[PDB]
Design a protein around this ligand. Sequence first.
Ligand code: NA
Lengths: 244, 49
Amino acid sequence: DRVAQLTIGNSTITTQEAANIIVGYGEWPSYCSDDDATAVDKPTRPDVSVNRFYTLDTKLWEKSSKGWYWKFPDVLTETGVFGQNAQFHYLYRSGFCIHVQCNASKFHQGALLVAILPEYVIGTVAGGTGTEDSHPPYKQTQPGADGFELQHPYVLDAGIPISQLTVCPHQWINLRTNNCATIIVPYMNTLPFDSALNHCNFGLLVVPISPLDFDQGATPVIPITITLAPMCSEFAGLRQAVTQ
Amino acid sequence: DRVADVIESSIGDSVSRALTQALPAPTGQNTQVSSHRLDTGEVPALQAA
Ligand code: NA
């Protein structure tokens, strides 16, 4: 139960210090029913070429880090064959298998909260005073694969408490216990299909709740890598490639 | 006894010959699976307005 292997497509992930697997809302990704669908054109289900593990950028965990987030359909729109299909097709649909990995040693300590927040809408500080109706820039609402850093993690940059973020599919990475978190997310939206460009079904939040710490001499560079794989990907409404 | 064109006559038919019938349609028509069709003779796309 502490060891596990995730194989999908032509990619395999290994781990010897896992903490089980979470299946968001107790549901596995699935394809769209014939009665839940509307688009009449036959969709493309590329399978193995898009349903595989993509490893996005690595972040560095510092004793003062606040946390980061990634919007999901988004992080992959410019990567591999998944990205190509997401650009050529109007409609997209899929679940995800998210595997956040971060290892240290038996002498390091700290705890990361890895959670999935559906429809993660970002807010602004409203000019500090709260009298200015400002809005988050495109660079912040859809940060891409590089993710974005939280400025006010306590309120998740959206006026909501992070202490309650656990009502969402989550898992923790407690260095003294495990070195990775695995969460499987089904397609969640009020529509059977939607644009992979304009809409971000959910956001991945990785936030340090218990600060990283260690004594001088132990390796100081502790990376946090994000690996994710689409599941049951379906695309429809073919046309030319659109970036945004 | 009676002239033939009068017997076989159809003047008087009060029933309106209808070429169409009203069918039940409580919902929008469904779409059925379709595959590629590469053939000659059949041209669904071509019409004559
Ligand atoms: Na009549």
